[PDB]
């Protein structure tokens, strides 16, 4: 079916982690270094775990 | 799009659709009462552990 | 239990009874053809623009969707149907004036005739205004205790005065739309219909006298052989006295002494029905509006009061009973409305048959369009629908006459009448043939 | 558009000032318990409460909001997402807002209809009058109650197909009474 | 008609009034499919409204309270849900009686017009009925009435019978017929068509 919802899909800033390089970083919610000024609510950490 | 999200359809038939706007967020307040001579108290709840 | 003309006459070769003289009788009916449509905003009504409410209607966007589509797709079927039935011919509209029915005194008063006194109540004086009968009618809707139709909404969003009752309904998302056919088009539509009887020739502005119109409409019942001037009088005087007793029942003004007929009983069926029709639209809404003060087991009947006492994690439970309570209040209103849309759709279906077969055509279905054999029918406007005036035939005298249904000569040749409705009979030593509808030998 | 708190009543709207005097109590409610107006006590003037966002009746033709049958004026419905010539007309009963200039459009293909006002493709509202016909009749098959004059008899003919729909069945539903009020 | 339906035909651009007959249908068929999936889904979704009780499921109630006091809580579920049926039932019997008028209408249109070329003016289309073809549709029929339409006329002086030498009268047997001269030759025709 279909449904309405308030979902987190407003992608401010996409940070593609490469598979090979270094699977370790930090992510700040408020004003990180990889994204200039902005502050988000969720980190959707998308993966094939 | 707000009409479409209220209609649950990606395409609308042409016609008349009751639409409005989300109003605002910040509004200046307004408080009117019967005029009275001011007698204002200041009671605080104080918890010390 | 019969009106012995126009019906089947399944008796031959006996002492049959054939009617001689005739009179007319007018019986009025009412048919309601439209309802004033209402466009209801679903989201405004359950919460008057509150921001925290609309994040809780997302659970119930299925229920809110059907309520709008139940009302629009019922209303849109009206305007598609009504705009394809109501047609005004401007040629015949210029014959509906009562001054046209008086100005043709060449020879006789042609475009009126002996029926002029009754028709003076039905036709408008100038081209475009209501006639005498509707003026009596529309003095029984405002004096019924109601009446406003020119609802401007530009005045509603101005703040010049404290709000009108009508503008207060708009603030809660309830739009009383204008009528899909106003009073003026109904006045034009019915006046175009009566002009079709005075007008027969398109490309000649001369018009037919109305006495020729009735004399023609007698022939379709039975072929009139000999016509007399006395027959025109008794039809006309009974016609004009029928309209006066109609006019006296309406607004208590006519020129008579005291008369208790049964044309009141046709009229009392109408005046009860028209009285109810104006008394729905102002009452379903005012019941629906007044259900915005029933706090359905909650703190207060206004939503912004609730969000200024409680926090959002617990105020949602309180405002949930407002939502599900008010959403049921719409379905109580919607199902009452779709009752009326489907009920009118039967009556509007009935009005197309009566306009086409009887106002335009002199239908021969017995009993339909009045009571007895139909001669003609005149219409007038009314509050939301038409008001018919069926003119039926009525016999008074009869003829005890022995009959046969064919000749056998010298026991060799048989002869049968080609028409079965005809019958053969001797008449003061002379054998004649007549239909069994009228005594037209 | 403010947020008021007037004598215990509460809500959002637009407050104006008027010149009309009523000799009565403090405030004036509707039939639904909403504020419509109220009287200042220190002076005589009364004010008018109008809600901030009235409804509208926006008309869409093919994935585009053409115009809005509105009530106020300059409600937006056209403006922006990031970061025009938005006209405003005046009907007898409502305003009307559409970016088309009352010049030389003179062509639009599809209409959305209502009682006396139909909105066509380029925002142009036409006034729907009553459909004029020649004679309110289809002069064959009907009674022809005119003789011995200069009558008019039709010669040529053509056909015209008009379709109708009639609904004859509904899908029946058998509801168990006992299962529904309690699932076993 | 075909161009209005599924936007495929072989033409250029035509704005007729057969759309206005067709738009009456396509609105109506669109509503008919949009009832049956919506009265039930409203009725089903009233099994989550705890009508002033603990929870919207019954077996939750009997696993918190004892039978002497759980009956009062489940009573509001029963009388609440029994009203939810009568809201559904009365909406349904509205439609059964409404269809019974339309199905009554369909027997008249099938018998008098699809099979018989009825002569009630205005019924089965708009004007004089020639024939009518039907097709299936979602829950009902789709008619195609074919009516007559005149284009030209004949300004013609008329009479309605002959009196010869002021002795004998003659009247036309059919009243619909009428007598008239026609380029110096007297003919007789019905007043329906020009068939001299
Ligand atoms: C049910 O049955 C009835 C009977 O069969 C059918 O009724 C017939 O319907 C047709 C079509 O509606 C009628 O034909 C004519 O319709 C014309 C309007 O359509 C347009 O074309 C005209 C030009 O001909 C345009 O002017 C119109 O444009 C409109 O918009 C402008 C604004 O820009 C306005 O100013 C206009 O007024 C229009 O609103 C449309 O594009 C209509 O104009 C035409 O008019 C006749 O009568 C008027 C009255 O004054 C005359 O002035 C005009 O000249 C026409 O008069 C006759 O003489 C000319 C000779 O030049 C003939 O060629 C005409 O055929 C006509 O006899 C006319 O009304 C038709 O009349 C009507 N009745 C019959 C018996 O056919 C219904 O269709 C059918 N369905 C329904 C639902 O009723
Ligand atoms: C963690 O694991 C998950 C699970 O494996 C990983 O997720 C998987 O990701 C896969 C892609 O990386 C996805 O695989 C397919 O995606 C296809 C879409 O892309 C295809 O098409 C483009 C180009 O398309 C153009 O041409 C085609 C025709 O040739 C047209 O149809 C297009 O419109 C374009 O014009 C190519 O460039 C790509 O290479 C792909 O070919 C799908 O199309 C595809 O399968 C579809 O068909 C199947 C039947 O054969 C059907 O079962 C399946 O559902 C697909 O059908 C979908 O799409 C069609 C398109 O018309 C639509 O009509 C159907 O309704 C339906 O939408 C594959 O889906 C995997 O599906 C996805 N999960 C699976 C099941 O493996 C994830 O990546 C991983 N995360 C990591 C490791 O990063
Ligand atoms: C509602 O309906 C009723 C029922 O018809 C109407 O009442 C009729 O009113 C008319 C007009 O007053 C009456 O007609 C007149 O009758 C007079 C004679 O009546 C007497 O004699 C007859 C027998 O001949 C008796 O049956 C009757 O009881 C009386 O004793 C005539 O003198 C009148 O004709 C004269 O004037 C007319 C012009 O007005 C000329 O045409 C004639 O040449 C003549 O000089 C006249 O026709 C009728 O009798 C009444 N009917 C009944 C049953 O009483 C109401 O008028 C009507 N209400 C309205 C219209 O508002
Ligand atoms: C309601 O009553 C409260 C209780 O008194 C009021 O709070 C008081 O607000 C005043 C504002 O001037 C404070 O005075 C300031 O104090 C700060 C430093 O605060 C600290 O040091 C003081 C020393 O006296 C100590 O009392 C405080 O508790 C803190 O340790 C100074 O830097 C300012 O210059 C100024 O002197 C009071 O200190 C404060 N009292 C408390 C107990 O919080 C409150 O304002 C009242 N609300 C109203 C009237 O609306
Ligand atoms: C159908 O209608 C016919 C025409 O009215 C009916 O025929 C009539 O039947 C009645 C029966 O009551 C007869 O009236 C009776 O007359 C006799 C005397 O008749 C004899 O003498 C007279 C002269 O006095 C003479 O003219 C006759 O030829 C007879 O020789 C009385 O004794 C009775 O009291 C009664 O008044 C009519 O005479 C008769 N008329 C004709 C022309 O035959 C017929 O009966 C009807 N059929 C039905 C009702 O089934
Ligand atoms: C929508 O349809 C409406 C109904 O058809 C239109 O109203 C019509 O507007 C026309 C414009 O021609 C009017 O025609 C009139 O002609 C008269 C002449 O009549 C004068 O003399 C007669 C007696 O000979 C007298 O009875 C009249 O009162 C006049 O004194 C002009 O004087 C009028 O001004 C006007 O030109 C129609 O009469 C009028 N119909 C009605 C019933 O009102 C309306 O205009 C249409 N709107 C559109 C098309 O936008
Ligand atoms: C019913 O239809 C009849 C047939 O059309 C109508 O008769 C026609 O009436 C018109 C009235 O305008 C006449 O036309 C006029 O003709 C005169 C001249 O006629 C005289 O001279 C001509 C030769 O030039 C001669 O043929 C005639 O016999 C006359 O001696 C003009 O001065 C006028 O301007 C006008 O054009 C027709 O002549 C006439 N035709 C016939 C055969 O009588 C009749 O009027 C219609 N009735 C109605 C509409 O009520
Ligand atoms: C129907 O028409 C008649 C007569 O027709 C009128 O006169 C013709 C000559 C034409 O010009 C027609 O176009 C015109 O309409 C109207 O009759 C009027 O009747 C009244 C009496 O009912 C007469 O009034 C009287 O006049 C005398 C003096 O002559 C006075 O003593 C009286 O006080 C009284 O006023 C009136 O003169 C007469 N009108 C004319 C024009 O002669 C009739 O009113 C009309 N019916 C309607 C409009 O309903
Ligand atoms: C995982 O790998 C990433 C690189 O892919 C490491 O981040 C990088 O760390 C190096 C130092 O080892 C940084 O280089 C230095 O950066 C500073 C920034 O001020 C600069 O001043 C120095 O001159 C030098 O360039 C590098 O910037 C940084 N970012 C990169 C290159 O992506 C990360 O530390 C590794 N995580 C581990 C080892 O846990
Ligand atoms: C995120 O946004 C903030 C602003 O809200 C950025 O801070 C801004 O940084 C720039 C660059 O340093 C400042 O401009 C500088 O101005 C001085 C003169 O005053 C000039 O000499 C420098 O060369 C430069 O142009 C800007 O003033 C400053 N704004 C504020 C209000 O702090 C911040 O850099 C952004 N972060 C990113 C890039 O994501
Ligand atoms: C029944 O019809 C006859 C024939 O039309 C009427 O008889 C005429 O009546 C008038 C009186 O109004 C007399 O002046 C005529 O001489 C009668 N003619 C004949 C041939 O008898 C009779 O009046 C009608 N009956 C009623 C009750 O009106
Ligand atoms: C209705 O629309 C018009 C056009 O937007 C607005 O026009 C003017 O707005 C200014 C704002 O100060 C006023 O001072 C003028 O008096 C307005 N003119 C009028 C009468 O339209 C107008 O604002 C809108 N409605 C109102 C009454 O403000
Ligand atoms: C309307 O017609 C004009 C000329 O007839 C044409 O140039 C224009 O493109 C048309 N509008 C459309 C097709 O939207
Ligand atoms: C009338 O008839 C004559 C002879 O039959 C013929 O010459 C003339 O053309 C006819 N008139 C017409 C057809 O208008």
Numbering used by the authors:
A (entry chain A): 310 to 358
B (entry chain A): 506 to 554
C (entry chain C): 848 to 1288
D (entry chain A): 702 to 784, 796 to 896
E (entry chain A): 1093 to 1288
Show me the paper's own sentences about this structure:
We report here a 3.3-Å cryo-EM structure of feline infectious peritonitis virus (FIPV) S protein derived from the serotype I FIPV UU4 strain.
The recombinant FIPV-UU4 S protein was overexpressed in a human embryonic kidney 293 (HEK 293) cell line. Using a 200-keV electron microscope, we determined the 3D electron density map of the FIPV-UU4 S protein to 3.3-Å resolution, which revealed a propeller-like homotrimer structure with an overall dimension of 180 Å in diameter and 170 Å in height. The 3 monomers are intertwined through extensive interactions between the conserved S2 subunits, while the 3 S1 subunits form the propeller blades. Based on our cryo-EM structure, we defined 5 distinct domains within the S1 subunit: domain 0 (residues 1 to 275), domain A (residues 276 to 540), domain B (residues 541 to 695), domain C (residues 696 to 754), and domain D (residues 755 to 791). The S2 subunit consists of an S2′ cleavage site (residues 969 to 978), a fusion peptide (residues 979 to 1055), and 2 heptad repeats (HR1 and HR2), corresponding to residues 1056 to 1156 and 1342 to 1403, respectively. Compared with the cryo-EM structure of the S protein of human CoV NL63 (HCoV-NL63), which represents the only reported alphacoronavirus S-protein structure, domain 0 of FIPV-UU4 is rotated 90° with respect to the adjacent domain A. Such a pronounced conformational difference could stem from the extensive glycosylation at N254, N357, and N491 that wedge between domains 0 and A. Among the 4 selected alphacoronaviruses, FIPV-UU4, HCoV-NL63, human CoV 229E (HCoV-229E), and porcine respiratory coronavirus (PRCV), FIPV-UU4 S protein has the longest loop 1 in domain B with a distinct helical conformation, rendering it more solvent-exposed and potentially more accessible to host receptors than that of HCoV-NL63 (19).
